[PDB]
Amino acid sequence: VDATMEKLRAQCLSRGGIQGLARFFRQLDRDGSRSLDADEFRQGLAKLGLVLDQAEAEGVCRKWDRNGSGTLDLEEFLRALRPPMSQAREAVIAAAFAKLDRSGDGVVTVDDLRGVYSGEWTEDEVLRRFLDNFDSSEKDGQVTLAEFQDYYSGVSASMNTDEEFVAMMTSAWQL
Amino acid sequence: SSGLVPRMDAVDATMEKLRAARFFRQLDRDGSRSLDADEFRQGLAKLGLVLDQAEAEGVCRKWDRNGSGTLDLEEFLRALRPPMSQAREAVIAAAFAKLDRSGDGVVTVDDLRGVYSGRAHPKVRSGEWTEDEVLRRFLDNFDSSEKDGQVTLAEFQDYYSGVSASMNTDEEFVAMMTSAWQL
Ligand SMILES: [Ca+2]
Ligand SMILES: [Ca+2]
Ligand SMILES: [Ca+2]
Ligand SMILES: [Ca+2]
Ligand SMILES: [Ca+2]
Ligand SMILES: [Ca+2]
Ligand SMILES: [Ca+2]
Ligand SMILES: [Ca+2]
Ligand SMILES: [Ca+2]
């Protein structure tokens, strides 16, 4: 399934880079509804020699559907086809996430930031504003690993080598 | 001395030289889609690499994983892999040593739990997978074809034989591994 999802990109790499993904997105969207259903997604991949069944399709849509619409919009689809980051880059992030997550339950919260960072604006209200920086656009007081990972998708994309990324992360977080 | 097993040196020489599908099919004189000890023997002579009868039989016996008495494509492809240098063997063992927390010779989910947290994983955050299930999933990749939550050094080595063969220089391979397992 992930192998099928990688063959898609390998195939997209034959010309298509992210502006091309929107172009392909809209050719997948048969009804033009501006989102992809598991059905539309499946028939589109079939046209490319990639085969998975409906339950597999819903599964892929389930994974990338970030707002529980049961469907893939342009943003989610673009995030789906982003070439995954190399493992070394992923490892330093992982590493820095562990640091940040004092409590080590799997998510970073205002409480994890207590003791590590610090009339109007109070204490953890400031701490909350810090948490927000790394959080998604819709702040909910929790930072996942996936979210933390997005926060750095920008600079990572800019930086051409793992060592540039690795060196930066190492110093930022004193790993 | 203890730990040593007797093994044939002249076979190692002939086997090296050889290393340096199209080829398999050439050698498969009788089109059986597998190599007799006898055919392998004749093929190598036709190429100027000399092996007697038992030496050729010895090589089939040791690469014929499934015990068909013969070498098929998968088995032949494996045999031609270059021997693993001290350096590559060293990073593999260091990575295995790291994973095997209990130090009982096998890497299990229980080992892994002391090395990695699986909690931050997206499939755990959605409620669909447990930490141990992500950890088991990770373990399976290194496991033999029959998954049993146990990965032995043999199995670990077998897993990396293929990957190793993919990279040209010891240094690429050593650095890869050092970044993969953070040693
Ligand atoms: Ca649609
Ligand atoms: Ca959606
Ligand atoms: Ca936490
Ligand atoms: Ca969040
Ligand atoms: Ca034959
Ligand atoms: Ca065989
Ligand atoms: Ca163990
Ligand atoms: Ca547990
Ligand atoms: Ca096993």
Curated annotation (Swiss-Prot), chain A:
MF annotations from Gene Ontology: calcium ion binding
Residue positions binding Ca(2+) 1: D29, D31, S33, S35, E40
Residues reported to bind Ca(2+) 3: D101, S103, D105, D112
Main location per the UniProt record: cytoplasm
Keywords: Calcium, Cytoplasm, Metal-binding, Phosphoprotein, Repeat
Residues given in the record as Ca(2+) 2 binding sites: D65, N67, S69, T71, E76
Repeat as UniProt keyword: yes
Residues with the Phosphoserine modification: S35
Annotated GO CC locations: cytosol; nucleoplasm; plasma membrane; vesicle
Disulfide bonds: none
Subcellular location: Cytoplasm
Gene Ontology biological process: intracellular signal transduction
Keyword Phosphoprotein among record annotations: yes
Superkingdom, natural source: Eukaryota
Function comment: Calcium-binding protein. May play a role in cellular signaling events (Potential).
Self-association state and partner proteins as the record states: Monomer. Does not form oligomers in the presence of calcium.
Name the UniProt record assigns to this protein: Calcyphosin
Gene name of the encoded protein: CAPS
